[PDB]
Amino acid sequence: NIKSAIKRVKTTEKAEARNISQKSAMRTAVKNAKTAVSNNADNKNELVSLAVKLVDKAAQSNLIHSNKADRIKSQLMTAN
Amino acid sequence: MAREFSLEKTRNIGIMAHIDAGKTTTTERILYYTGRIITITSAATTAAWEGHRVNIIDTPGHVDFTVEVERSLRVLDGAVTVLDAQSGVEPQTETVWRQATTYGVPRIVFVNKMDKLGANFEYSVSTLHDRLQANAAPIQLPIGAEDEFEAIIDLVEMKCFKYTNDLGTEIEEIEIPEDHLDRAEEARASLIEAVAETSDELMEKYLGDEEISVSELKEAIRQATTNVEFYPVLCGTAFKNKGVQLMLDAVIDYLPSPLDVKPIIGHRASNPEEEVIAKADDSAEFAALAFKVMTDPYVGKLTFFRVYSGTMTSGSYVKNSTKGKRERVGRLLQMHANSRQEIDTVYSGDIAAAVGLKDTGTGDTLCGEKNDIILESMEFPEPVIHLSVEPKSKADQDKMTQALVKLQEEDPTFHAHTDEETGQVIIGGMGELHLDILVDRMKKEFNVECNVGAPMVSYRETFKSSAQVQGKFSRQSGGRGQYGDVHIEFTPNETGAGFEFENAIVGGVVPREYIPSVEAGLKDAMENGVLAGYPLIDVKAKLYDGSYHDVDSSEMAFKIAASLALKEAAKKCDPVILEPMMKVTIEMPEEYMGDIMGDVTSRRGRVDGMEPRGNAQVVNAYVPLSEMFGYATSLRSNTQGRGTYTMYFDHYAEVPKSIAEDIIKKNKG
RNA sequence: AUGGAGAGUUUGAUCCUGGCUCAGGAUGAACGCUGGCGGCGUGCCUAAUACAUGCAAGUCGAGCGAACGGACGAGAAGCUUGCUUCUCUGAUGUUAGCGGCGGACGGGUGAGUAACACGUGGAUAACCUACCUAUAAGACUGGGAUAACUUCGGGAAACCGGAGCUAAUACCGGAUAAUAUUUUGAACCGCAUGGUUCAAAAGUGAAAGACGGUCUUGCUGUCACUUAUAGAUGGAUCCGCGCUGCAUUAGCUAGUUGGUAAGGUAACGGCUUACCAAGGCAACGAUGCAUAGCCGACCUGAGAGGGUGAUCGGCCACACUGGAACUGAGACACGGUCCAGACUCCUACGGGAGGCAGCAGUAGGGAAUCUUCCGCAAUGGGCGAAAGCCUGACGGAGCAACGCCGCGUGAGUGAUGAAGGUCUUCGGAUCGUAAAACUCUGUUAUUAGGGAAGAACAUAUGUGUAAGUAACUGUGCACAUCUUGACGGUACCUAAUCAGAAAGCCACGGCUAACUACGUGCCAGCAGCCGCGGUAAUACGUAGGUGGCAAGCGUUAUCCGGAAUUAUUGGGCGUAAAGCGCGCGUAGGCGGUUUUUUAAGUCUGAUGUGAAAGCCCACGGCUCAACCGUGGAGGGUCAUUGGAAACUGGA
Ligand SMILES: CC(=O)O[C@H]1C[C@@]2(C)[C@@H](C[C@@H](O)[C@H]3[C@@]4(C)CC[C@@H](O)[C@@H](C)[C@@H]4CC[C@@]32C)/C1=C(\CCC=C(C)C)C(=O)O
Ligand SMILES: Nc1nc2c(ncn2[C@@H]2O[C@H](COP(=O)(O)OP(=O)(O)O)[C@@H](O)[C@H]2O)c(=O)[nH]1
Ligand SMILES: [Mg+2]
Ligand SMILES: [Mg+2]
Ligand SMILES: [Mg+2]
Ligand SMILES: [Mg+2]
Ligand SMILES: [Mg+2]
Ligand SMILES: [Mg+2]
Ligand SMILES: [Mg+2]
Ligand SMILES: [Mg+2]
Ligand SMILES: [Mg+2]
Ligand SMILES: [Mg+2]
Ligand SMILES: [Mg+2]
Ligand SMILES: [Mg+2]
């Protein structure tokens, strides 16, 4: 094993933990927003805005691709 | 760069002794002490003692493994002969002593196992004097014997060492006790006389009644030892760590260096008559002798060699002048008590292992590329026991041959050859133990299960009675007609004279064209046995008459006639079976001569004679080769391992009635 | 026009047919014999067999805390003012750790793969792209942790946990910003689907500081950071055509083929799922089996063709076997992770570790293929602002007649045909101008001196100039100076000495250049074919001589040739091998005359491309040559486009 390889193991573990936390958060927000849009609720627009915020922040963190974020936003905002 | 130890400080030694005398204990203690401010493996181990490099080779004791002793003594400078205190000189001690003497190796004797019950230092020295006829004298005395053994009186310095524990530490250097003072002074006088028997200067100095100096007496002992005229005798117990330091001190003080030793003589490859002296000189040309070859599972094939003259660096090219090829010395290793170190260079008087030598067997010379010297090889004893070997599964015969080749390269004393007559492969070794170990190693290491037995004996036939006989073959009934007819007298020839064909034809009754054909037919028919299938020998065939047909006569017809003539001669002449008889020359002490002659006569042999030779006896006898199977073991049992013999085919003799009938029955069915 | 040779052998003899054999070239060759040197190349083709050992991937202190360290130089006199502590200052430096980038390149191998893998030509209005470049706009305001470190506990080791504390160019909240997303309107345009531009709004997150200059903490240089749009680079997908043997493999297919909807992806898409339908492929060879990386090229051939796919370059695939995802711009990752499997190793028996198809090397297999070498000086790459570090890439050296090319092993005179060998017709012939002897040279070799280029630089130091500045330091560019070589004191040059150290292999019956004497006597042996050998052997072995080659020469293996012996070029079927025993007839192949039309074939012009290296032609540089370099020409059954209509095809 190379020293840089061991270091990369550590840093990869850290990055994975952070990324999966953030991705789970954005997935939860997207699911909540989609449910609110599907069944009209007074919280619909605020939930959609939160979903879009987290989707775009994920795209900027590179958790999803820009085109993935665009598809999510397109479907969400067309439903809403 | 610069050798860490000089030629004057280098010591190449070998621990030799009888079985279970303490060679490996002594070597382990030596390595431990040199390695302190222990597994013993490899051909040689390099350590350091008091600023001296010490290469140690531990040898085997068994007469079956005399090849190791031979090949070690060839490249070693000094030897430590270990003796069991309770028994002194034993048969294998005598054997290794004679090998060291034939190689002119200085020796120091070490009486181990002083703590054992029955230990007797004086009796061990007396055995040295009597059994070996060696000018050995003690340079130490043991205070206490068996459990009482607790001090050693060094006699060169008249100083007593007291050992307070079995750990080998906390030795007290004290003055000789008063009660042992007289005995110590008498032993010193005896030692001085023994050395003076070789040194004239010392002899005059002692006769003058003047006091001998410590330095002068050390010098004298060193000179005598290096001349192989004096053996210093020490004592101790390697198991309980007493006397090992003194033994190493004596190794340093008395055993020679590659300088003190006599030079080495070799032959130019292109000028065999030319002689080349290879002295211990770094600046001289590089010449070394490869004395051991093994395979190490980590680093590959190792070639252990001793360098006599010159230097050589790892990662270079050398000449194998014996195989006349070029070898790449890739890596050079030296084995220490606990580890192997890679070493960049090797100097005269160093034993090392090369990694990368291909096709370099033991006894080969490795010389500089430009040089073409060939050092003196090693002579090893001829096989004393032979066994027909054969794989249990014929599908493994190729593996068996390859294993035999590798094993013959590993061990010079083990031989394998195919016998044409019998079509059997035979393996010759130094004894039953040797062959047993080799069989087991083939079975396991090489995964070739083999079975061994007594080698088949090729028998011969002959005619005991003379007779005139005739053979006549006619084949005119069908198609082409063939006629042959011959009249031949068959006579018992003088033993050993071979087949003799005589042509007493008168009047051309047998055309001269067909007579060679008759001879060829007789030869073929006698090659094929007439009684049990073995060739017929010692016969005079006199073709004295015959008939022929101007047309039907043919070479094949006359061959058929000769075949029928030999068939009727075998019917009419009472053939017997002959067996090879070996001229056996047995050498042993006179006290076993009766046993040896009794065994000879019990083997159906006859004692030809006896004769003194040196300090022993020689018995000459003729014994059947069949009855000579397993004779080495019986001889060693009869003579306490002191007896040796040689055998060579001498003539054929008639097999007794019962044995011949048994042969015949076996061959028939 | 640049280019094409045949011979032996079936018979008493002949012509024909027909196979066999030989003369040529080639090689990653192997073996036998032999062996002087130099230059340039090439060197595990077998076991994608297993691997000891060393090295092949790090770097950044000008991102960050901490630790070690201790100049310059403080204080008391031990009365030692030269040695001394801690109460300091502590600079030049070094590091384990967090963090950034790089570990996806470079290097190895050809196992798998018959497939859009590869080659060629196209398309993407179905796509992605870190570092680099250009332009524009920004870099605002706050916060919580954690490594390291200290402490406690458990371990043979691998190393593990509990508690406490601290940084950042690490992480996160908030603010403003969009050509990105939703909706509305408009303009233009295109290869269905749609593309480009403009105008309104709604949802909306980005960022960071480090080292300096001026010092007015205001301005500001370099580097670094963020968003958007372009360029470049790199990657992805699709399509026409081409690219292999077998029918003693004829049926295959059920997410299979299409549609609808959704999910998913950089992206279109049965890519996946639910529903509906029964489609899809196939004698123009589906399916199955076997084998195989493909190409540029290489060998051969007059060509057409045939064979091959080492070295070098491109593309692909793989990294003990199989699956998987993580991080990341990029991997489903040779020297990363997880799981399973096989195998191996260490252990204190509690438990741990590994993957040379990287460079050397070991064992094994094999007829057979090298050093566990030196250096980053050159080129290239990673990191860094830079010096510099790393780089088994690479540059070199070592070994091997393995190949090609070059030069040696002497030259002139030398009849007096010296000795001696072999033959003899006993005269003589021949080895033979060969030798001897006289004269000459030193390529080579030995000795002693001189000794390159490859080296550009970078950095550092001086100026000059250009953008910006309020002005500097800096940045770009230009001109100068110090320094930088593993090879290596090697190539090469000079001076002296000696013909002195340096020739072997095969063949000599015909093919096929080269003949005699002895020994043998169908024996020993030779042999590619025809054959030779039983007393006169140019064929067996030796000797002399001769022939061909020559540091090589022979043998074996394999490919093309000769072979028109699979015949398109360029053969045949009465009797030599070959007409189905003969009809009826399907697909396919082929098809009478004239007129008009189309332009699929056919012919012709232009454009793009067919990488580099290679082959051929020319020139230049190594003293020559091989070799190296530079231009040209060539190479498509290639694509787009414009023309002609006789022939084949269509109407
Ligand atoms: C000095 C040393 O190391 O000796 C060792 C080494 C030893 C001589 C061994 C006995 C025997 O295998 C030996 C032979 C000749 C056995 C045959 C081959 O394989 C040889 C290549 C091998 C070399 C040496 C070896 C391996 C030893 C013995 C004897 C052991 C005793 C008995 C009864 C079996 C010993 O240890 O004394
Ligand atoms: N009593 C006694 N036994 C000893 C001594 N030294 C060695 N031994 C034992 O004697 C035997 C000899 O064995 P080893 O040392 O292998 O000797 P080798 O046969 O010469 O190789 C072993 O059992 C040793 O332990 C000693 O000093 N005293
Ligand atoms: Mg022993
Ligand atoms: Mg394959
Ligand atoms: Mg041809
Ligand atoms: Mg990797
Ligand atoms: Mg690896
Ligand atoms: Mg390797
Ligand atoms: Mg082998
Ligand atoms: Mg042809
Ligand atoms: Mg016919
Ligand atoms: Mg017919
Ligand atoms: Mg028929
Ligand atoms: Mg080209």
- DSSP per position, B108-142: EEEEE-TTSTT--HHHHHHHHHHHH---EEESEEE
Point out which residues pair with B582 in neighbouring strands: B623, B649
Interior angle at CA B242, CA B237 and CA B243, nearest 5: 95
Report which DSSP code applies to A8: H
Nearest Cα to Cα of residue B149 among B111, B188, B107: B111
CA B52 to chain centre: 33
Alpha helices in B19-86 (DSSP H): 23-35, 66-75
| AA identity, residue B443 | K
Contact call for residues B491 and B544 (beta carbons, < 8 A): no
**Ligand 1 pocket test, candidate residues B92, B437, B445, most atoms within 8 A of CB:** B437
Q: Structure tokens of B144?
A: 């206490």
Contact call for residues B311 and B347 (beta carbons, < 8 A): yes
Nearest Cα to Cα of residue A45 among A15, A76, A12, A69: A76
| AA identity, residue B458 | S
- Distance CA(B128)–CA(B132), nearest Å, equals 5
- Three-state SS for B484-515 is EEEEEEEEECCCCCCCEEEECCCCCCCCCCCH
Q: How far is CA B20 from CA B31, B70, B117, B245, in A?
A: 19, 19, 15, 21
Interior angle at CA B17, CA B23 and CA B228, nearest 5: 115
Contact call for residues B94 and B88 (beta carbons, < 8 A): no
- Distance CA(B562)–CA(B470), nearest Å, equals 9
Say if domain B382-459 classifies as CATH 3.30.70.870.
yes
Shortest CA–C1' contact from B330: which nucleotide?
A: C372
Q: B406 CB less than 6 Å from ligand 1?
A: no
Interior angle at CA A18, CA A17 and CA A20, nearest 5: 65
CATH of domain B263-381: 2.40.30.10
- Distance CA(B249)–CA(B232), nearest Å, equals 12
Contact call for residues B331 and B314 (beta carbons, < 8 A): yes
Give the CATH class of B460-579+651-669.
alpha beta
Resolution (in Å) of the shown entry? 2.5
Q: Which residues of B174-183 are buried (b: 16+ CB within 10 A; e: fewer)?
A: eebeeeeeee
Contact call for residues B486 and B562 (beta carbons, < 8 A): yes
Interior angle at CA B279, CA B273 and CA B285, nearest 5: 80
For chain A, the domains span 1-80
Confirm whether any atom of chain C, the nucleic acid strand, is less than 7 Å from CB of A31. no
Phi, psi of B64 (to 5 degrees): -70, -20
Q: Structure tokens of B606?
A: 């006859």
Protein-proximal positions, strand C, CB < 7 A:
52, 57-59, 97-103, 127-129, 171-174, 178, 180-183, 202-206, 227, 263-267, 326-330, 333, 335-337, 354-355, 361-363, 365, 370-373, 399-400
Alpha helices in A1-80 (DSSP H): 3-38, 44-61, 66-79
- Distance CA(B286)–CA(B354), nearest Å, equals 14
Confirm whether any atom of chain C, the nucleic acid strand, is less than 7 Å from CB of A22. yes
DSSP 3-state assignment of B427? strand
What fold, for B2-262?
Rossmann fold (3.40.50)
Residues ≥6 apart with Cβ < 8 Å to B586: B596, B600, B618, B619, B620, B621, B635, B643, B644, B645
DSSP 3-state assignment of B148? helix
Nearest CA, atom 14, ligand 1:
B65
Q: How far is the CA of B520 from the C1' of C529 (A)?
A: 37
Residues ≥6 apart with Cβ < 8 Å to B460: B534, B535, B536, B537, B577, B578, B579, B580, B652
The method recorded for this entry reads cryo-EM
Nearest Cα to Cα of residue B192 among B248, B258, B139: B139
Residue intervals of chain B classified under CATH 3.30.70.240 are 580-650
DSSP 3-state assignment of A55? helix
Q: B410 CB less than 6 Å from ligand 1?
A: yes
Element (H, E) at B283: none
- Distance CA(B177)–CA(A48), nearest Å, equals 109
Q: Structure tokens of B169?
A: 């530490």
Interior angle at CA B312, CA B309 and CA B315, nearest 5: 160
- Distance CA(B286)–CA(B266), nearest Å, equals 13
Contact call for residues B384 and B65 (beta carbons, < 8 A): no
Residue intervals of chain B classified under CATH 2.40.30.10 are 263-381
Please count the CA atoms within 13 angstroms of the CA of B116 that sit on its side-chain side: 21
- DSSP secondary structure string for all residues of B447-470: ---EEEEPPP---EEEESS-EEEE
Could you tell me the distance, in angstroms and rounded to a whole number, from the CA of residue B297 to the centre of ligand 8? Answer: 18
- Distance CA(B257)–CA(B255), nearest Å, equals 7
Nearest CA, atom 15, ligand 1:
B65
- Distance CA(B55)–CA(A36), nearest Å, equals 90
Point out which residues pair with B470 in neighbouring strands: B487
- Distance CA(B261)–CA(B283), nearest Å, equals 18
Q: Structure tokens of B54?
A: 């010490």
DSSP 3-state assignment of B292? strand
DSSP 3-state assignment of B173? strand
The breaks in chain A (C to N more than 2.5 Å) occur after none
Could you tell me the distance, in angstroms and rounded to a whole number, from the CA of residue B531 to the centre of ligand 11? Answer: 64
Residues ≥6 apart with Cβ < 8 Å to B402: B446
Helix B121-132, helix B91-102: angle, nearest 10? 60
Q: Report which of residues 306-345 in chain B place their beta carbon less than 7 angstroms from any atom of strand C.
A: 314-315, 317, 326, 328, 330-331, 342
Residue holding tokens 């900027």? A60
| AA identity, residue B565 | A
Burial class from Cβ neighbours inside 10 Å (0-12, 13-18, 19+) for residue B22 reads: buried
Largest CA distance in chain A: 57
Q: How far is CA B488 from CA A65, B235, B569, B594, B603, in A?
A: 113, 80, 9, 50, 39
Residues around the ion ligand 3 (C-beta < 5 A):
B 23-24
- Distance CA(B47)–CA(B45), nearest Å, equals 7
Point out which residues pair with B461 in neighbouring strands: B536, B577
Give the CATH class of B580-650.
alpha beta
Nearest Cα to Cα of residue B129 among B116, B138, B117, B140: B138
Contact call for residues B74 and B103 (beta carbons, < 8 A): yes
Q: How far is the CA of B230 from the C1' of C465 (A)?
A: 98
Nearest CA, atom 12, ligand 1:
B437
Strands (E) located in B245-356: 264-268, 275-278, 287-296, 300-309, 311-313, 316-320, 325-329, 331-335, 340-342, 345-347, 350-355
Neighbour tally for B594: CB within 10 Å: 10
Q: Structure tokens of B626?
A: 């069949």
Residue holding tokens 């004086």? B122
Contact call for residues B123 and B159 (beta carbons, < 8 A): no
Element (H, E) at B435: helix B432-444
Q: Structure tokens of A12?
A: 């990869």
Q: What are the contacts of B634-638 at 24+ separation with CB within 8 A?
A: B634/B599, B635/B586, B635/B588, B635/B596, B635/B599, B636/B63, B636/B431, B638/B588, B638/B592, B638/B595, B638/B596, B638/B599
Nearest Cα to Cα of residue B627 among B597, B602, B653, B598: B602
**Ligand 2 pocket test, candidate residues B15, B19, B20, B93, most atoms within 8 A of CB:** B20
Residue intervals of chain B classified under CATH 3.30.70.870 are 382-459
